[PDB]
C-alpha cells in the first residue's frame, strides 16, 4: 500500500587533495518530478577534520547523520579526543552495516583529512562496503560525473606491486575548479543535480565553504 | 543503632540514615566550589593526588557544550552519574536539536538518585554533584546531594575542608550577581586558597572550569591559571 | 531467582565460602596425579571396596573426553555436574573448532566456572579441588593440571588433593623424579601408600597413554602394592 | 522480588517445625470425622456458631468436589476455601483431558501435591488445614486423609481438630467392617454427641454420605435431625 | 545433487555414496567424503544441503559421543536411529533440516543393521536402503541381486554394478564413491572408487 | 527481608551443609527399608511406619512406587516429597524411552534424580528434599542393579543396604550375613530375618510391612511385583519357623 | 568477480581480480579482495561485498580473541570452522558469502571454502566468484603439483587474466599473493589491461 | 551481621569496597616503572612447592598489543577483569580500526568494579577483590594506571601493589628519577621487589614483563641476565 | 498433499465382543516403496490398538507420546487405560496443534469394559468419528468405505470377522496405487489376540 523510501536526487562530489579534500554537492530536492526545496543541504560535518556527504533518501540521510553525530559524541566524551577521519568512516560502516535488512537509502561519501593531514575520501554503498579511493561521486548524476573525473584525475592503482610512482598531484584552486565543472556537465544532463553546490574545502587552515549558481530548471 | 541497615527503613526520628551515610561520603572528597553570576558558571576544583610519584583524580567534566559538572565522593559513582547526564543531552539534542536546559536535567539527575534512595536492594548514589549550565535564562548552579534533593545557588561548596571556601563566598557571593568573567575567576582562585591550609596558591592544586552564555565549556589550561595566580 | 550474596567479603579481606569450600575438599578422598615424560598417571583414595558395595558401574577417575580424564576430590555431588559440563565443553570446542580441547583449555574452562560461582550471587560454591590430565593434541607431551575451589589453577609436575594432600605433597617433593612407564605408576602407588597404608583393596588408579585413558585391574595394583611393600622392607634393612 | 528463601527449614533434629506449627493449628480447629461403611462413606463435622445472628445456612463446611468425592477440613476455614478451588480446578483438568470423572486417589495425591508446594516454596507458610476426602469411585468406597505436611493416608475411620484423641479411640473400638452406611452415620452422630458440648441440632453438625455408586450429598437439616432422632 | 545406499549382507553393513561436493555447475571437489563415522561400530550417510548435512551429523555426533563416555556403555544402533529420528523430527516443524540419512551398524549381541531415515524423520529398518536419483537404479538393481546372506565379495560386487549404472544412466551421474563397511571389528572404511 | 532468610544452600566452617545434615536426620527417624541384590533378583522390604489399625492397607503399597517397567524404589523419609520426586522420576525414564526408544537404564535414572537433588542443595534458597532412595532394576548394560541416594543427591551401588530407622543394625547385620550367589528365595529370607532381628517387634505382622521384588521372568522380562497380605504371610510364617531352625544350635 | 586459491609444494598462492559492479556498472576497478585475517592467513571476498567484509572483520576479532586467551594463533581448520558456523547461524536470512580460508598452521598449509550457506570443504585447489568455471579451465589445465613459487604466481596470474577477458563482471588489477611456510606476501600485482598485450603481443 | 553487599559504613565508605581493598594486602607484591622508553612490570610468582609448574602461574596478562596487566589480590577475580578488558579493546577495534587508548582501557576495567549488588540488577554479588596495573603505550606515549576494588583508577609514574605496597612505594619515591633509561627502571624494580620477596630472586621466582612498543613477557634466560646486573 | 505423501490403508470392524484392526504394509516417499514391512498398527495393550494412518513420521511421533503417556497413567492409576478415554486422549493431544497439526488420521479400536468393543478415527485435529459398524482411514477412504459398506454385517464371530476384515481391506487397497505390499490384521477377543499377515499383490 504504502512505501518506506524515497528517492531524492541530488548528487554529492568528493575530491582528495594531496594536502585538502573538497566535497561539493546541490542544494536541490525533490521526490517524482516535482521540487519540494531548493536549499537542502546534503553535507554534514560530522568532525572536525570528517565531512559526509550523502544522496538518497532524505529521511535516511537526515537520521544517518545525526546518528553518527551523537555516537561521535559519545565517543569525545569517552576517549577524550576527536574522532580521527578513518576511525569515522570504519564507524560508519558499522552502523550502514548493522541496518543490513532494512537499509538506510542513503549513498555516502566521506572526505576529510587523515591523522597525518592527507586528504582522504571514502566512498560507501547503501550496505557499508566501502574504499578509500581519491575521489568519488554519489547519487543521481554520479554516472554523469564519473567519466570526466577519471579522465581528469587517473593515478596508477594502489594495488600494483612494482609501484608504479604517482601522477603530480593536482593544488587545490584545480581540484574546485574540476568540481564546478562535474556539477556543470551534471545538471546540464540530469533533472536531479542543480540550484547550487556547497564545497567544503578541509585544510589545515579549517574548513571553509563556497556556493556556485547552477541552472534552475 | 539497627534503623541503619537497609535503606527503606525510616528511623523514628524521622531520619533515614543510610542516607545520610552517602551524604556524608561527599565530605571526603576534595573542595569542589562552583560560584554564579548571571552569564557565567564557574567550577573549581582541588587536586589531591595520593603521593609524590603518583598523579591526582580528575574531578571536573564535562556534559555538553553548556553544562559542566564538579563531583564530590566516590569516583565509581560519579562516572556512572556523568556518563548518564551526557546521554541525556546528547538525547535531548538528538530529539529536538536544541541544547537541554540547566534545571530540567538537574531535577531529572535529582530523580534519578531518588529512586536508589527507595528501594530494599538499591543504594543510595554517595556522589554529590554540583551541576553548573546554561539556560534560555542565563547561567544557574545546582547541587544534587546523594538524598535526591537538589538546590540552587549563587556559590557554593562541598567536599572535605570545603567550610572555608564556603565562608569566604558567603562574604562575597552579593558581587557575582553583576560579575564579569575574569572576576568570577579571580573568586574561583581565592575561594580555593581559603582552603590551601597554608601553601600558596599555585596551578598545579587546582582546576578551573567556566561556562558562559557566549562560551562553550571550557577547562583553563595549567599555565594561563598560573599567569592568573601570579597576580 | 534467588540472589543472595553467599559468597562476601570478611572484614579482613577473605572470602569465607570459599575457605570452607576449601575445607570441605580436605574432607574428600585423597588423589594424586603424577606426570611421567610419556604417561600421567591418577590415583585415589577409595575404590568403594567395604565388602557391599557394588561398584561395578562407576569409577572415580573420570573420562571427560576419550583426550582427557579428571580426578575430583570433595562432594562427589558437585563432582557430576562439574563433570558433565566439562564433558559438554569439550564437545561443543570439537564443534566450534575442529580441534579437540587442549588440557590447559579444559582446566581454565573448569576454573573460570568455579571462579563465577564463587561470585556469582544466590549460589553456593562448588566444594571441589579437581585434578585434570591429558596429551595436549599433536604434541604427545603429557600434562598435569588441578583447580581449586577458588577458581585458581596451574600446572604440576605431581600433585595430591583430598585429606592428607599435605603429607603426599611432601612425599611427592621428596620422591619425585622423571619417571617413565611402570615407574610413574610406582611413585603414583608409594605417594597413596603414604596415606591409604590399607593398600590394594582401596586405591583405583589409572594411566593416560597418548593413545587414551585405561584403569588398572585389582591383580595390577596388587602387583604393584606387593612389589613396594617387599623392596620397602629390603631397602629399609639394608640402611638399617 | 526475591522471596526465594524456604521459611520451613530443617531444625537440627531433622523435624520440620513450620509444618508442625501447622499440625498444631488444625490442632485446634473443631472437629471432624469420617467413616466408611462396607457400602459407602461418612464424613462429619460440627459446625457450632458464634452467635445466633449468624445465617448458619449461608457456609457449609462439607463441600463436594466432584459428584463422587466431598471434603470436610479441620483447622482454619480460608485455607480449606483455596484448596477446595484448587481441587475443583485439577477435577475439571482431568474431565476436560478424558471424559471420565477423576478417581479418588488421583484427586488426593494432586491435592496433596499442592499442599506441599507450601511447605517448601519460599514466602508462605503451609496450610493451616487437614482434610478428610470421601469418596465412592469404580474400586469401592475411600476415604483420604490430607495433612499440611502434605502426605495422605487411607483410613477405614478417622478424625481430627478439636478432641481428636476421644473421637478418634471412639471410632476404633466402635468401628467394625461390613458396617452398613446407616450404621455409620449414626456412628459419627454419636462420636459428635461425645465431645460436642452443648446439645446436637440439625443447624450445629454438617453430614455428607456417599450410596452406592450414587452421588455425595450433603444432608440437609431437615433429615439429618430425622437420622439423630 | 548426493546419492546414497545401504545393503545388509550376512555380518556386514555396506554403505556407499558419491564424493562429489559442487555449487551450481562446478565439483569443486570430487573428494568429498560423507560417510561418517558416529562410533567404532556405526555409519552414518547423509544426503541432503550440504551445510544442513554438515551441522546435523555433526550434532548428532557430539551427542552420540556424550552418551559413550557419561555411561561407559555406546548406543546400540537402534537407539542411535531413534535420537536421531526424534532431534530431526522436532527440528522438522521449527527449523527444518533438510538431509536424508541412512544409518549402519553392528551391535554384538544383534548383528548389523541398516535404517531408513527420512528428512520428514520416518524412520525405518530396511534390509536395504537409496537416497537421490541414483536411488532408482541402485534400489532396482539390489532388488534384483539381493540375498540375505551376501558374503562381502558379493556385497561388494554388488555394490560395484549399482555405482556403474548409476555413472551410466544418470545424467548428474557423480564420477567417485566411496564405501564404508561395519562388521564386527567395526565402522571402516572398504575402498575407494575412482574413475577418473 | 533479609533476616528472614536461613541461607539453606551456604556452607558452615565445618566445610560440609547443614540442612542436608538434618534432611539424613529425618530419614534416620523414618521409617525402616532394605534391599537385597540377589543373583536371580532384587528384592526391597519396607516398615510402614504409620501402623493405626484403623488404616485400611487395603491400597497396595505406601513406601515402595513403581518407576517403570523394569525399575522401582523403595522411599524412606518424607513421603510428600517423596511423592514429587517419583513422579519426576517416572516423568525422566520416559523422557529417555521417548528419545531413544528403549528402556532407561537404571544407573542413569538414580543419577538424573540425583542431580535434581543437588540442585536445591547448591542454589536457590530452598530447602533440600528431605528423602533416600532405594532403586532396583534390570538393564541390559549390567543386569540386576541396586542403588541408594542420600538425600545430599548422592547415590552408590549396594549389594545390600538399609535405609531409615536403625539403619546401621541392619547394615551390620547384612555385612556379616550376605554373601554372593544370594538367590531369590534365600534374599527373601535373609531380608526378613534382617528386618525381623532389627524390629523391636518379633513375629510380625503383614499389615506393617512391604515386600517387593524385581526379578527377571523365565521370557526376558522383568517383572516387578509387590506380595499380597497372604503372601507375606506365608512368608512371615516360613521365616519365624526357619529362624528356630538354625538357631537350635 | 573470481578468486582462486591452491595449495602447492611451496605453500598456497591466492589470487583475485579487483572489480566491483553493480548491475551493470564498473562501481570500481581497485577493490581489495584478498583480506588480511593474519600475518600466516588470508580470505577471499566473494559475493557480497558488504558481507564479505564485514563477516572477514567478525572472524578477525575472534582469531585475535583466540589468540589472547589461548596465546596461540589459530589454526586455519578453526578459523574456517569459527566463520561456517557464524555464517550458518545467519542461514536464512539472505547473506552472501565465499572465501577461501588459506593459510599456514603448525600442521601445514590450509585452505578451505566456505560459503553463506554454511558449507565448508577442504581442497587443495578452489575459486569463487562470476568467473570461476574459466579460472578453473586455465587452473586445471596449467596447475601441478611440484611447480615452483615464480611460476605458480605465474599461473595463478594467468588463470585470473583469462576470467577477467572472458566475464563482464571480472576485471581490473590482478593481485597474487603468496602465503609461505612462515607468512604471506604480495608477490605481484598487475593491471589487466597490460597484462592481456603482454600475454598477445600487439606486434 | 546480615549487612547488605551495598551498605554505606556511618563514615560513608562502603563496607564490602574496605573489605575487598583488604584483599589485596594479601596478595603478591606487583610493581611498575614508568619511563620515556615505556614501562616495566614484575610481580612475585609465589611458587609454593618445586612440584609447581613455574610457568603456569601468570600474573601479568596481556590485555591488548600495547596494554599489560600487573595482577593482584585474588588472581581468580582478575582474569574476568582481563578477558572483559580484551573483549573491550578488541570490539574498539572492530568499531573504529584503531587501538583503544590505555586511559579508555582502564577506564573500562574500573566501570566493571562497582556493578557488583543483588536483585537481579547485576548478576555479580561481590567486588572484585584484585587491583591491577595497567601499563601500556600509546598516542599520549608510556602511560601506567592502576586500579583498586572501589572501581576507581589513577594515573601514576610508579607503583607497587600487594603485599609490599607501603615499602615498595616508600622506596620508589625516594629514587624513581624521572630520567630513567629502561635499562636503570627494571633493575631498581628488580631490587624493590628482592627485598620485599622472602624466598631468594630467581629467573623463576619472578615475572618481568616491558611494555616498550610491544608486550613482552621475560623469558627465564632473560630474566638470569638482569638477575646478574642487579 | 501432504496426507498422501506415504499413502496407508487402515480399516476397523466390529464383530460379536470380537474387535478387528486391519492396515496396509508399506513405506513409500511418494512411490518408491522404500520397505513392503510397514507398520501403522501399534498395539498399546490388550484389546486396545491404534491404527494412525497419513504421514509416517507424524505417526511414529504420536506413537512414541502416546506411549510416554499411557505408561504414566498405568503407574499413576494401575489400570490400563480404557478405550474411550484413550481416544478422548489422542483427541486432545491432537487438537493442542490445532494450527500445527500432525498428518494423521488415527483409527482406534479395542475391546474393554465388560468385553464391550469401540472403535472411532478421528480428523487430523481430533474430531472424532465413534462409529460401531466400521471405520476406514489412510489414502484408500473412499474404496474402503465401498468395501465395508458391502462386505460388512452387524454382528460377526471372530472367523467371519477375519474373513471380510480381509477381503475388504485387500479389495479396496487393490484398487489403490500408493497402498498395498501385503496385509497386517488383528483379530482380538476377549480371550485372545490374532495377528496376521496377509499375501497381497506386490505391485
Same mark, same amino acid.
Given at each position: ?217 | ?58 574531578? &571536573?567534566? $564535562? ?10 565522593? !566516590? ?36 530523580? $534519578? ?16 554533584? !554540583? ?68 601553601? $600558596? ?27 592568573? &595566580?601570579?597576580? | ?240 | ?128 488445614? %487437614? ?22 493416608? %487411607?483410613?477405614?475411620? %478417622? ?71 | ?196 | ?41 532384587? #528384592? ?5 511406619? #504409620? ?199 | ?77 578453526? =578459523? ?21 580460508? =588459506? ?31 574459466? =579460472? ?22 594467468? =588463470? ?44 | ?22 584483599? @589485596? ?108 596495573? @595497567? ?72 615475572? @618481568? ?22 | ?9 487402515? +480399516?476397523?470392524? +466390529? ?13 513409500? +516417499? ?36 502416546? +506411549? ?136
Amino acid at each position: 500500500n504504502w512505501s518506506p523510501y524515497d528517492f531524492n536526487g541530488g548528487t554529492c562530489v568528493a575530491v582528495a587533495g594531496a594536502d585538502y579534500c573538497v566535497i561539493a554537492a546541490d542544494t536541490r530536492m525533490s521526490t517524482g518530478y516535482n521540487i519540494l526545496t531548493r536549499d537542502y543541504s546534503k553535507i554534514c560535518k560530522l568532525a572536525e577534520k570528517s565531512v559526509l556527504a550523502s544522496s538518497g533518501f532524505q529521511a535516511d540521510v537526515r537520521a544517518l547523520q545525526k546518528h553518527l553525530d551523537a555516537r561521535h559524541l559519545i565517543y569525545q566524551h569517552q576517549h577524550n579526543k576527536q574522532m580521527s577521519c578513518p576511525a569515522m568512516a570504519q564507524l560508519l560502516s558499522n552502523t550502514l552495516y548493522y541496518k543490513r535488512f532494512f537499509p538506510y537509502y542513503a549513498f555516502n561519501v566521506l572526505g576529510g583529512l587523515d591523522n597525518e593531514g592527507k586528504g582522504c575520501v571514502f566512498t560507501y554503498d547503501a550496505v557499508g562496503s566501502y574504499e578509500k579511493v581519491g575521489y568519488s561521486s554519489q547519487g543521481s548524476g554520479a554516472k554523469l560525473i564519473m567519466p570526466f573525473l577519471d579522465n581528469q584525475l587517473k593515478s596508477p592503482s594502489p594495488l600494483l606491486i612494482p609501484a608504479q610512482d604517482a601522477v603530480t598531484p593536482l593544488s587545490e584552486s584545480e581540484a574546485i575548479d574540476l568540481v564546478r565543472t562535474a556539477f556543470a556537465s551534471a545538471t546540464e544532463r540530469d533533472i536531479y543535480t542543480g540550484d547550487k553546490l556547497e564545497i567544503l574545502v578541509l585544510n589545515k587552515e579549517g574548513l571553509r565553504r563556497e556556493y556556485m549558481e547552477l541552472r534552475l530548471d | 543503632n539497627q534503623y541503619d541497615t537497609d535503606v527503606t527503613t525510616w528511623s523514628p526520628a524521622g531520619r533515614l540514615f543510610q542516607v545520610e551515610y552517602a551524604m556524608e561520603a561527599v565530605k571526603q572528597g576534595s573542595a569542589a566550589i562552583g560560584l554564579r553570576s548571571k552569564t557565567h558558571v564557574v567550577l573549581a576544583c582541588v587536586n589531591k593526588a595520593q603521593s609524590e610519584l603518583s598523579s591526582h583524580q580528575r574531578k &571536573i567534566f $564535562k556534559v555538553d557544550d553548556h553544562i559542566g559538572v564538579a563531583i564530590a565522593g !566516590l569516583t565509581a559513582d560519579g562516572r556512572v552519574l556523568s556518563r548518564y547526564m551526557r546521554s541525556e543531552c546528547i538525547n535531548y539534542g538528538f530529539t529536538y536539536e536544541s541544547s537541554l536546559p540547566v534545571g530540567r536535567l538537574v531535577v531529572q539527575l535529582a530523580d $534519578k538518585a531518588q529512586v536508589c534512595t527507595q528501594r530494599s536492594w538499591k543504594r543510595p548514589y554517595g556522589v554529590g554533584l !554540583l551541576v553548573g549550565g546554561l539556560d534560555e535564562s542565563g547561567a544557574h548552579l545546582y547541587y544534587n546531594c546523594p538524598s535526591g534533593n537538589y538546590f540552587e545557588y549563587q556559590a557554593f561548596a562541598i567536599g572535605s575542608r570545603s567550610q572555608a571556601a564556603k565562608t569566604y563566598l558567603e562574604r562575597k557571593f552579593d558581587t557575582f550577581d553583576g560579575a564579569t568573567r575574569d572576576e568570577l575567576i579571580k573568586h574561583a582562585l581565592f575561594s580555593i586558597k581559603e582552603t590551601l591550609q597554608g601553601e $600558596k596558591l599555585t596551578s598545579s592544586v587546582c582546576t578551573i572550569s567556566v561556562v558562559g552564555v557566549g562560551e562553550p565549556f571550557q577547562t583553563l589550561d595549567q599555565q594561563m591559571v598560573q599567569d592568573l &595566580i601570579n597576580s | 531467582r534467588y540472589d543472595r550474596a553467599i559468597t562476601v567479603f570478611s572484614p579482613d579481606g577473605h572470602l569465607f565460602q570459599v575457605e570452607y569450600a576449601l575445607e570441605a575438599v580436605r574432607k574428600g578422598n585423597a588423589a594424586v596425579g603424577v606426570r611421567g615424560t610419556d604417561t600421567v598417571v591418577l590415583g585415589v583414595e577409595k575404590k568403594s571396596a567395604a565388602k557391599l558395595q557394588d561398584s561395578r558401574s562407576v569409577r572415580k577417575i573420570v573420562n571427560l573426553d576419550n583426550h582427557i580424564a579428571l580426578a575430583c576430590a570433595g562432594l562427589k555431588a558437585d563432582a557430576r555436574v562439574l563433570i558433565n559440563k566439562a564433558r559438554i565443553e569439550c564437545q561443543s570446542h570439537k564443534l566450534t573448532l575442529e580441534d579437540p580441547v587442549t588440557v590447559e583449555y579444559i582446566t581454565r574452562y573448569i576454573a573460570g566456572l568455579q571462579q563465577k560461582y564463587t561470585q556469582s550471587g544466590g549460589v553456593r560454591p562448588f566444594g571441589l579441588s579437581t585434578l585434570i590430565v591429558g596429551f595436549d593434541p599433536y604434541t604427545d607431551v603429557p600434562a598435569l593440571y588441578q583447580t581449586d575451589p577458588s577458581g585458581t589453577f596451574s600446572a604440576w609436575k605431581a600433585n595430591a588433593t583430598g585429606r592428607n594432600s599435605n603429607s603426599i605433597r611432601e612425599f611427592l617433593e621428596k620422591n619425585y623424579k622423571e619417571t617413565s612407564g611402570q615407574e610413574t605408576v610406582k611413585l603414583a602407588i608409594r605417594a597413596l601408600l603414604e596415606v591409604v597404608e590399607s593398600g590394594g583393596k582401596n586405591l583405583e588408579v589409572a594411566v593416560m597413554r597418548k593413545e587414551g585413558l585405561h584403569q588398572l585391574e585389582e591383580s595390577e595394583i596388587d602387583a604393584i602394592v606387593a612389589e613396594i611393600e617387599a623392596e620397602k622392607a629390603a631397602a629399609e634393612a639394608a640402611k638399617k | 522480588s526475591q522471596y526465594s528463601f524456604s521459611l520451613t527449614t530443617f531444625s537440627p533434629s531433622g523435624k520440620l517445625v513450620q509444618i508442625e506449627h501447622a499440625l498444631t493449628a488444625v490442632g485446634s480447629g473443631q472437629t471432624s470425622l469420617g467413616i466408611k461403611a462396607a457400602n459407602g462413606v461418612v464424613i462429619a463435622t460440627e459446625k457450632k456458631l458464634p452467635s445466633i445472628l449468624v445465617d448458619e445456612a449461608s457456609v457449609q463446611k462439607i463441600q463436594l468436589l466432584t459428584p463422587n468425592i466431598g471434603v470436610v477440613y479441620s483447622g482454619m476455614g480460608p485455607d480449606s476455601r483455596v484448596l477446595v478451588r484448587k481441587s475443583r480446578k485439577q477435577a475439571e483438568q482431568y474431565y476436560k483431558l478424558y471424559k471420565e470423572p477423576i478417581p479418588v486417589t488421583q484427586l488426593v495425591r494432586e491435592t496433596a501435591a499442592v499442599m506441599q508446594e507450601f511447605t517448601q516454596s519460599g514466602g508462605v507458610r503451609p496450610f493451616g488445614v %487437614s482434610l478428610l476426602i470421601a469418596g465412592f469411585d469404580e474400586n469401592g468406597p475411600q476415604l483420604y486423609q490430607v495433612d499440611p505436611s502434605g502426605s495422605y493416608f %487411607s483410613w477405614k475411620a %478417622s478424625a481430627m481438630g478439636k478432641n481428636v484423641s476421644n473421637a478418634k479411640t471412639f471410632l476404633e473400638k466402635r468401628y467394625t467392617d461390613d458396617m452398613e452406611l446407616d450404621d455409620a452415620v449414626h456412628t459419627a452422630i454419636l462420636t459428635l454427641k461425645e465431645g460436642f458440648e452443648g446439645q446436637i441440632s440439625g443447624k450445629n453438625i454438617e453430614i455428607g454420605i456417599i450410596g452406592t455408586d450414587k452421588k455425595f450429598r450433603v444432608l440437609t437439616p431437615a433429615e439429618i435431625d430425622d437420622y439423630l432422632g | 545433487m548426493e546419492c546414497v545406499f545401504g545393503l545388509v549382507g550376512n555380518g556386514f553393513a555396506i554403505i556407499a555414496a558419491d564424493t562429489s561436493a559442487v555449487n551450481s555447475i562446478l565439483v569443486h571437489k570430487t573428494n568429498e567424503d560423507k560417510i561418517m563415522k558416529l562410533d567404532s561400530h556405526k555409519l552414518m550417510g547423509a544426503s541432503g544441503e550440504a551445510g544442513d548435512r554438515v551441522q546435523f551429523t555433526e550434532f548428532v555426533q557430539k551427542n552420540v559421543s556424550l552418551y559413550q563416555f557419561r555411561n561407559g556403555i555406546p548406543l546400540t544402533t537402534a537407539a542411535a536411529a531413534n535420537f536421531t529420528r526424534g532431534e530431526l523430527a522436532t527440528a522438522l516443524r521449527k527449523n527444518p533440516y533438510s538431509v536424508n540419512i541412512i544409518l549402519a551398524g553392528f551391535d554384538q549381541d544383534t548383528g548389523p543393521s541398516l535404517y531408513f531415515i527420512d528428512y520428514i524423520a520416518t524412520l525405518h529398518k530396511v534390509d536395504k536402503a537409496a537416497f537421490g536419483y541414483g536411488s532408482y537404479f541402485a534400489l532396482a538393481m539390489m532388488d534384483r541381486h539381493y540375498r540375505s546372506d551376501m558374503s562381502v565379495d558379493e556385497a561388494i560386487k554388488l555394490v560395484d554394478e549399482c555405482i556403474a549404472e548409476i555413472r551410466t544412466r544418470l545424467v548428474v551421474a557423480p564420477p567417485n564413491f566411496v564405501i564404508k563397511i561395519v562388521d564386527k571389528d567395526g565402522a571402516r572404511e572398504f575402498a575407494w572408487r575412482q574413475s577418473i | 527481608s533479609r533476616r528472614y532468610d536461613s541461607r539453606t544452600t551456604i556452607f558452615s566452617p565445618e566445610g560440609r551443609l547443614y540442612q542436608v545434615e538434618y534432611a539424613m536426620e529425618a530419614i534416620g527417624n523414618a521409617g525402616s527399608a532394605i534391599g537385597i541384590l540377589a543373583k536371580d533378583g532384587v #528384592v526391597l522390604i519396607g516398615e510402614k511406619k #504409620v501402623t493405626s489399625k484403623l488404616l485400611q492397607t487395603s491400597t497396595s503399597t505406601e513406601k515402595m512406587y513403581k518407576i517403570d517397567d523394569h525399575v522401582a524404589c523403595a522411599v524412606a523419609g518424607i513421603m510428600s516429597d517423596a511423592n514429587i520426586l517419583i513422579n519426576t522420576a517416572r516423568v525422566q525414564a520416559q523422557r529417555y524411552t521417548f528419545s531413544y526408544q528403549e528402556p532407561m537404564p537404571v544407573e542413569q535414572l538414580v543419577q538424573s534424580l540425583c542431580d535434581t537433588k543437588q540442585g536445591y542443595t547448591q542454589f536457590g534458597g530452598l530447602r533440600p528434599f528431605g528423602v533416600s532412595f532405594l532403586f532396583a532394576g534390570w538393564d541390559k548394560n549390567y543386569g540386576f542393579q541396586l542403588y541408594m541416594s542420600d538425600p545430599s543427591g548422592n547415590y552408590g551401588g549396594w549389594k545390600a543396604t538399609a535405609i531409615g530407622a536403625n539403619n546401621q543394625a541392619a547394615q551390620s547385620m547384612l555385612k556379616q550375613d550376605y554373601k554372593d550367589d544370594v538367590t531369590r528365595e534365600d534374599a527373601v529370607k535373609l531380608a526378613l530375618k534382617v528386618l525381623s532381628k532389627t524390629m523391636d517387634s518379633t513375629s510380625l505382622t503383614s499389615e506393617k510391612l512391604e515386600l517387593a521384588e524385581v526379578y527377571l521372568l523365565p521370557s526376558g522380562k522383568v517383572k516387578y511385583q509387590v506380595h499380597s497380605p497372604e503372601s507375606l504371610n506365608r512368608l512371615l510364617t516360613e521365616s519365624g519357623l526357619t529362624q528356630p531352625a538354625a538357631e537350635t544350635s | 568477480t573470481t578468486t582462486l586459491a591452491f595449495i602447492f609444494k611451496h605453500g598456497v598462492m591466492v589470487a583475485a581480480d579487483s572489480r566491483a559492479s553493480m548491475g551493470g556498472y564498473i562501481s570500481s576497478q581497485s577493490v581489495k579482495k584478498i583480506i588480511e585475517i593474519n600475518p600466516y592467513m588470508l580470505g577471499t571476498m566473494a559475493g557480497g561485498a558488504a558481507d564479505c567484509q564485514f563477516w572477514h572483520r567478525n572472524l578477525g576479532i575472534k582469531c585475535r580473541l583466540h589468540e589472547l586467551a589461548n596465546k596461540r594463533r589459530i589454526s586455519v581448520t578453526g =578459523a574456517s570452522k569459527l566463520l561456517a558456523n557464524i555464517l550458518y547461524n545467519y542461514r536464512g536470512m539472505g547473506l552472501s558469502v565465499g572465501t577461501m580460508i =588459506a593459510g599456514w598452521d603448525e600442521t601445514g598449509p590450509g585452505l578451505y571454502y566456505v560459503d553463506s550457506e554454511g558449507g565448508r570443504l577442504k581442497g587443495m585447489r578452489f575459486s569463487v566468484g562470476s568467473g570461476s568455471p574459466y =579460472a578453473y579451465g586455465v587452473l586445471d589445465n596449467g596447475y601441478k603439483y611440484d611447480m615452483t613459487v615464480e611460476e605458480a604466481s605465474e599461473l595463478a596470474r594467468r =588463470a585470473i587474466y583469462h576470467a577477467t577477458y572472458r566475464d563482464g563482471a571480472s576485471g581490473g588489477v590482478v593481485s597474487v599473493y603468496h602465503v609461505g611456510p612462515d607468512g604471506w606476501k604480495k608477490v605481484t600485482g598487475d593491471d589487466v589491461g597490460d597484462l592481456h598485450f603482454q600475454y598477445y603481443p600487439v606486434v | 551481621y546480615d549487612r547488605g553487599v551495598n551498605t554505606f559504613s556511618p563514615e560513608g565508605r562502603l563496607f564490602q569496597v574496605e573489605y575487598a581493598i583488604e584483599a @589485596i594486602k594479601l596478595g603478591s607484591t606487583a610493581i611498575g616503572i614508568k619511563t620515556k622508553e615505556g614501562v616495566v612490570l614484575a610481580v612475585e610468582k609465589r611458587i609454593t612447592s618445586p612440584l609447581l609448574e613455574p610457568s603456569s602461574v601468570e600474573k601479568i596478562m596481556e590485555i591488548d598489543d600495547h596494554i599489560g596487566c600487573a595482577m593482584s589480590g585474588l588472581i581468580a577475580d582478575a582474569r574476568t577483569l582481563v578477558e572483559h578488558a580484551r573483549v573491550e579493546t578488541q570490539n574498539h577495534r572492530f568499531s573504529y580500526g584503531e587501538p583503544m587508548t590505555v586511559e579508555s582501557t582502564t577506564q573500562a576495567l574500573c566501570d566493571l568494579a562497582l556493578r557488583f549488588g543483588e536483585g537481579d540488577e547485576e548478576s555479580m554479588s561481590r567486588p572484585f577483590g584484585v587491583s591491577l596495573l @595497567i601499563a601500556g603505550h600509546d598516542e599520549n606515549g608510556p602511560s601506567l594506571y592502576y586500579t583498586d576494588p572501589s572501581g576507581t583508577f589513577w594515573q601514576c609514574s610508579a607503583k607497587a601493589i600487594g603485599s609490599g605496597s607501603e615499602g615498595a612505594d616508600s622506596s620508589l619515591q625516594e629514587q624513581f628519577r624521572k630520567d630513567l633509561s629502561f635499562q636503570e627502571a627494571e633493575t631498581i624494580a628488580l631490587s624493590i621487589l628482592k627485598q620485599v620477596m622472602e624466598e631468594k630472586l630467581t629467573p623463576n621466582n619472578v615475572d @618481568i614483563a616491558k611494555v616498550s612498543p610491544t608486550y613482552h613477557l621475560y623469558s627465564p634466560s632473560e630474566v638470569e641476565a638482569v638477575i646478574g646486573r642487579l | 498433499s501432504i496426507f498422501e505423501y506415504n499413502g496407508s490403508a487402515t +480399516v476397523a470392524m +466390529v464383530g460379536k465382543n470380537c474387535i478387528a484392526i486391519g492396515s496396509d504394509r508399506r513405506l513409500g +516417499v511418494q512411490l518408491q516403496t522404500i520397505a513392503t514391512d510397514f507398520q501403522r498398527i501399534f498395539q498399546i495393550h490388550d484389546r486396545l490398538f491404534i491404527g494412525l494412518s497419513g504421514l509416517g513420521s507424524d505417526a511414529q511421533t504420536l506413537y512414541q507420546r502416546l +506411549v510416554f503417556r499411557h505408561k504414566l497413567y498405568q503407574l499413576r492409576e494401575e489400570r490400563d487405560m480404557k478405550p474411550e478415554t484413550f481416544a478422548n486422549l489422542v483427541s486432545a493431544i491432537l487438537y493442542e496443534k490445532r494450527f500445527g497439526p500432525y498428518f494423521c488420521q488415527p483409527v482406534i479400536a479395542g475391546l474393554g469394559d465388560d468385553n464391550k468393543p469401540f472403535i472411532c478415527t478421528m480428523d487430523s485435529i481430533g474430531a472424532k468419528e465413534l462409529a460401531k459398524d466400521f471405520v476406514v482411514a489412510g489414502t484408500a477412504s473412499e474404496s474402503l468405505y465401498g468395501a465395508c459398506e458391502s462386505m460388512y454385517k452387524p454382528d460377526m464371530e471372530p472367523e467371519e470377522l477375519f474373513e471380510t476384515v480381509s477381503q475388504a481391506l485387500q479389495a479396496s487397497v487393490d484398487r489403490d496405487c500408493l497402498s498395498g505390499w501385503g496385509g497386517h490384521v488383528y483379530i482380538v477377543t476377549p480371550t485372545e489376540i490374532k495377528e496376521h499377515i496377509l499375501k497381497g499383490r506386490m505391485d
